[PDB]
Structures are given as structure tokens and as C-alpha cells.
From a paper:
Galectin (Gal) is a lectin that binds to β-galactosides. Because the primary and tertiary structures of [name] are highly conserved among all galectins, it had been named [name]. However, our crystallographic and biochemical experiments (solid phase experiment, hemagglutination assay, and biolayer interferometry) proved that wild-type [name] could not bind lactose or a rhamnogalacturonan Ι domain (RG-I-4) from Ginseng Pectin.
However, this was not the case, and [name] did not co-crystallize with lactose. Surprisingly, we found a different compound bound in the ligand binding site of [name]. Mass spectroscopy identifies this compound as Tris. However, here, lactose could not co-crystallize with [name], but Tris could. However, the hydroxyl groups from Tris could not be merged with the oxygen atoms of lactose.
Numbering used by the authors:
A (entry chain A), B (entry chain A): 2 to 139
Write the structure that this text describes.
């Protein structure tokens, strides 16, 4: 891995920001690897989460948020266009009303903001991936 | 301009970070446009500056730092491979001992750290450019 995992990146996000994560799963899909990305409100892992994204490669994606320490109503989609054994590009674009999630250039979901994205101060990338790069662009 | 100028971007930098700035000068070189990038230690414009970079397009680059509010000994180079009227890519790479400055893929200088780069909390891009994008990568 070019970068350590879990990877905790301090960030400042605004409307128009894009988080770009490039990496490769460390297991084949028959072994049920996962990728997780959390938009944390502080560096502390127990802080609230504006957007939690967990990919079960070859299966489905689960999303949620944690407010006042409480996980809210989970959201899901079966559209997970990641390829077995290959590098992926995951883009999370901050729109005024939602995070748009793109996988390898394919829009898969829009997760609506329940707190403003400018409250996000750390992005954590975790679980079963080798991380090649992480970029924050505007 | 895709982005407002001056553009003040909160950042967290570490060894291995790269700041990538893409834009175009707003004047032809016969009109002496400038581009400035400052690695500020706070959002406040009067805070100390770990690395100040000022391009006089077609002419030269001046670099400095501001410590305890005092500008230190200025550094310069005549190598400014920006092209008149064209978009440029400026990359500032954080190495353990210096910022390496690349213009359109060409290394032009290494500005040695006098304070650690992790003290940089804001990057300001200013002066005579239309700003297409700014990215911070690791």
C-alpha cells in the first residue's frame, strides 16, 4: 500500500469538493472483502459521521450517518461496479444537497446531507484495500 | 475562473502531500502578470508563512518565509517555464526536507523547510490568474 490503512486524512470540505480514492482490494471477491469510507466530524473515531459508506465487493453497499452517537436509518444499493482484483477509482463529490458517489466513473448513488458537509473534518478510508492515492480537489 | 481569487484553502500537509494548482494568467506577459502561492500557518493573512512563492511571469520567481511576522532572506530563480496565454500546472510536493516546485512537469526549485510543513493550515492562491482547479493529494 502506498498509504497506511486505516488512513485518516484531515479535510475541509465545501460544496464543489471531490474526494478521489484509488486503490485495490486485498482479497478476491469470493473472500468477501470490504471497503469503508467515513466522513467524520472530528479526528476522534467516536465523533459523529456525516456519511458512512461500506462496500461489500461483489454484493452491495450500505450507507448511514451517526448523529449524537446514534446510527440513523441505513440506506443501501446493489449497484457496486467494482471489478475483482483490479484497481478502482472512487469519487465522492460534494453537491449542495448530497454526496454523489462514483465508482470507476459510474454514478451509483446520491446520499443526501443531514448535516452540512462543511462539518466534515476527517475522512477515514479503511478495511480490505491497498490504497494508492487519496486526493481532495476543488 | 472556476474558483474565486484570492482562493484560501484550508489544508493539512504532511510529507508526501502534493498541492496541484491549474489555471491561466489573466494578462499577456508584456503586461507583467504575477501568480502568488502562500503556505500559511493559519487562515488569518497576518499569520506566519512557511513558504511564499511569487511568479513574475516571463521574468523570475521570488520565494521567502515570514517568521514571527518578519520576512526572512529572499530566494530567487530565473527558471519560470510558464507559457504566455496558456493554462499551467503548478505542483508543490512536500518532501522531508523541502518543497519541490514543478511547473508544467518541470522541476524548478526546492525550498527547504525552516518550519515543519505540518504547521501549514491554509494555502492561498492569489494575483493575476484564473483558477481552474486546486487539489491536495497524498
Amino acid at each position: 500500500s502506498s498509504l497506511p490503512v486505516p488512513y485518516k486524512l484531515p479535510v475541509s470540505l465545501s460544496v464543489g469538493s471531490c474526494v478521489i480514492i484509488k486503490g485495490t482490494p486485498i482479497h478476491s471477491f469470493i473472500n468477501d472483502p470490504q471497503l469503508q469510507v467515513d466522513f467524520y466530524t472530528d479526528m476522534d473515531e467516536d465523533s459523529d459521521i456525516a456519511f458512512h459508506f461500506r462496500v461489500h465487493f461483489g454484493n452491495h453497499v450500505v450507507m448511514n450517518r451517526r448523529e449524537f452517537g446514534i446510527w440513523m436509518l441505513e440506506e443501501t444499493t446493489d449497484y457496486v461496479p467494482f471489478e475483482d482484483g483490479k484497481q478502482f477509482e472512487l469519487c465522492i463529490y460534494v453537491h449542495y444537497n448530497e454526496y454523489e458517489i462514483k465508482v470507476n466513473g459510474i454514478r451509483i448513488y446520491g446520499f443526501v446531507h443531514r448535516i452540512p458537509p462543511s462539518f466534515v473534518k476527517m475522512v477515514q478510508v479503511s478495511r480490505d484495500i491497498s490504497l494508492t492515492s487519496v486526493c481532495v480537489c476543488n
